[PDB]
């Protein structure tokens, strides 16, 4: 059970260098794949247990990957970041293996048999015939792909935004239910997360203890260049004013966490 955790900046300026880290826990190769919004997955590179590194040939000059076994990390460096490089960067582990042409067990490569007798599918001759060629000892090489690769574990991904605009933490405002906005025994209350940059923002309710009907909506990009979203949760109408309801807004890009209490709408 391998767990992969990406860490690094959430915001780059144009032409800055992106340095990411992946911390591997549990126990091939460890590498990086990215996906820009609305675009296809793009393999970047990987480093195997022996220290060998490989890179997307179209991006190799910009990439660099290193490892540390004592720290159980790998890194990723990406030079000359542009808006084209804004993407979610996933740390991965991959199964890798190149299979040479091998004969099955109890068989040995013997080119004399097909060379001299013309037998088919007979590159290998059973060892039980002790170097002699018998057609009932023929065999092809082990049937298998020459190259094996696939992603065995995916990290959760780190969103990286390239922009000249600077980080901004969010302003959190309450979406308080009114006496007319309820839904009988339940009611919708939420928080408006306003004017932050870059993405992402996550929102829980009561430190995760409240999950029923929770939904965080996609963010809107205002003309100011700042994002806004809303999170809503459904709540017992009889509890409005008795139970405390707090939306925990986390904005990792600015190392900001806001716990906003949502109190019943009041006529002060």
């Amino acid at each position: 059970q391998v767990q992969l955790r990406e860490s690094g900046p959430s915001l780059m300026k144009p032409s800055q260098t992106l340095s990411l880290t992946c911390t591997v826990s549990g126990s091939k190769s460890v590498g990086w794949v990215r996906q820009a919004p609305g675009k296809a997955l793009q393999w970047l590179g990987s480093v195997d247990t022996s220290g060998n590194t490989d890179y997307n040939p179209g991006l190799k000059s910009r990439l660099s990957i290193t490892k540390d076994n004592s720290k159980s990390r790998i890194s990723l460096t990406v030079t000359g970041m542009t808006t084209e490089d804004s993407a979610t960067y996933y740390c991965i582990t991959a199964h890798q293996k190149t299979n040479k042409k091998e004969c099955p067990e109890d068989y040995t490569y013997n080119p004399r048999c097909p060379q001299q007798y013309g037998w088919s599918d007979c590159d290998c001759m059973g060892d039980r015939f002790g170097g002699y060629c018998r057609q009932d000892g023929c065999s092809n090489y082990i049937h298998r792909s020459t190259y094996e690769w696939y992603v065995s574990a995916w990290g959760q991904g780190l969103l990286v935004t390239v922009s000249s605009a600077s980080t901004k933490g969010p302003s959190v405002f309450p979406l308080a239910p009114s006496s007319k906005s309820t839904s009988g025994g339940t009611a919708a209350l939420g928080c408006l997360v306003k004017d932050y940059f870059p993405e992402p923002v996550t929102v829980s309710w009561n430190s995760g203890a409240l999950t029923s009907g929770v939904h965080t909506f996609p963010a809107v990009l205002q003309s100011s260049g700042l994002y806004s979203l809303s999170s809503v949760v459904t709540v017992p109408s009889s509890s409005l004013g008795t139970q405390t309801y707090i939306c925990n807004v986390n904005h990792k890009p600015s190392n900001t966490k806001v716990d906003k209490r949502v109190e019943p709408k009041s006529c002060d």
Binding site: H95, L175, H215
Partner: protein
């Protein structure tokens, strides 16, 4: 280099669909294609490896095949929770140089219809004290995931100041969306009401708030 996939495929509940993945002898022809499922909001999920081998937890109705330089992912008995972007991938002339496909979006049709639940929030006291006003119209629990939002100031349409999100799936396979109307606190208070109209499958739900309505 990128493997070629169809842009999208769709099927109704219980139906069968297949996604193709075309490459060349140096990658797909090598005979070790992998498939991945990406559900918006979750990390990518490995589904198939080695052309036909299923990852742990993948049911049998997810089948992988290959003929020459074209691999195929067949998904039978379609269920709503299958909706996702599917990508193929393969080694390319090497067991460490990997290539991905362009991706294919899967839509599962025929899910239970559901009208939208609409909640309209007026500007909060805190936002007004900061000299800004935002009406928040939250739309949830509807299928199909298509709605149109229109705003009213008193009884007349409002065109300026509106931002609406494209619908996305909730944790219960139904769709949700949000719309915002930006105002100055002055014009919030200078009119008797504001409304959010949500239209879904020909039927409309309208919610209204008034500056005079405290509590």
């Amino acid at each position: 280099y990128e493997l070629t996939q169809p842009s999208s495929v769709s099927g109704s509940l219980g139906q069968r669909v297949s996604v193709t993945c075309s490459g060349s002898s140096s990658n797909v022809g090598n005979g070790y294609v992998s498939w991945y499922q990406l559900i918006p909001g979750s990390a990518p999920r490995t589904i198939i490896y080695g052309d036909t081998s299923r990852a742990s937890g993948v049911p049998e109705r997810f089948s992988g095949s290959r003929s020459g330089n074209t691999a195929t992912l067949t998904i039978s008995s379609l269920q709503a929770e299958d909706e996702a972007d599917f990508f193929c991938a393969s080694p390319d002339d090497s067991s460490s140089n990997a290539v991905f496909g362009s991706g294919t979006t899967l839509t599962v049709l025929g899910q239970p219809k559901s009208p939208p639940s609409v909640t309209l929030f007026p500007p909060s006291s805190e936002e007004l004290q900061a000299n800004k006003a935002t009406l928040v119209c939250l739309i949830s629990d509807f299928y199909p995931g298509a709605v149109t939002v229109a705003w009213k100031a008193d009884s007349s349409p409002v065109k300026a100041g509106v931002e609406t999100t494209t619908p996305s799936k909730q944790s219960n396979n139904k769709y949700a969306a949000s719309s915002y109307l930006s105002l100055t606190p002055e014009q919030w208070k200078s009119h008797r009401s504001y409304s959010c109209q949500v239209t879904h499958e020909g039927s409309t739900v309208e919610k209204t708030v008034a500056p005079t309505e405290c509590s």
